[PDB]
């Protein structure tokens, strides 16, 4: 899950000045700026609130599979927190499913890709 995260963050860091006051960019530079801002806001975490491995896997899967693109920049921390709360309560079985097969070579198993993308879609439709 984290290779795409690292690459996109590196591209965004390369594209620094353009984000902040260049206004003549296509939606190719600006797309990377947007996605990098999404991921950077995703890493903003409070104190004394650690996230287990399945939580980070689910959040980064949502972020890197374009399921978070429509969310505006300042609301991403709240989106992550709400998605986690939904995931504790609405579907603990998907958390258990992620945690059980986090060690297999090909993690996005169809059993896992289903019931995780499904949960993401349910949260997207139900909230906002």
């Amino acid at each position: 899950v984290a290779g795409k995260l690292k690459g996109e963050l590196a591209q965004f860091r390369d594209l620094a000045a353009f984000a902040q006051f260049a206004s003549d960019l296509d939606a190719t530079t600006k797309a990377q700026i947007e996605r990098g801002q999404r991921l950077q806001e995703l890493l903003k975490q409070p104190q004394y609130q650690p996230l287990p491995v399945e939580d980070q896997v689910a959040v980064l899967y949502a972020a890197t599979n374009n399921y978070l693109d429509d969310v505006p920049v300042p609301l991403i921390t709240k989106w992550r927190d709400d998605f986690l709360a939904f995931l504790r309560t609405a579907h603990p079985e998907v958390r258990k499913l992620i945690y059980d097969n986090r060690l297999d070579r090909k993690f996005p198993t169809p059993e896992v890709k289903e019931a995780l993308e499904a949960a993401i879609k349910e949260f997207k439709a139900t909230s906002n």
Binding site: A16, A17, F18, Q20, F21, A22, D24
Partner: peptide
């Protein structure tokens, strides 16, 4: 001119 505007922006930051 776009090259110069750029080189400004980059070496400014």
């Amino acid at each position: 001119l776009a090259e110069a505007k750029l080189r400004k922006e980059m070496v400014r930051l």
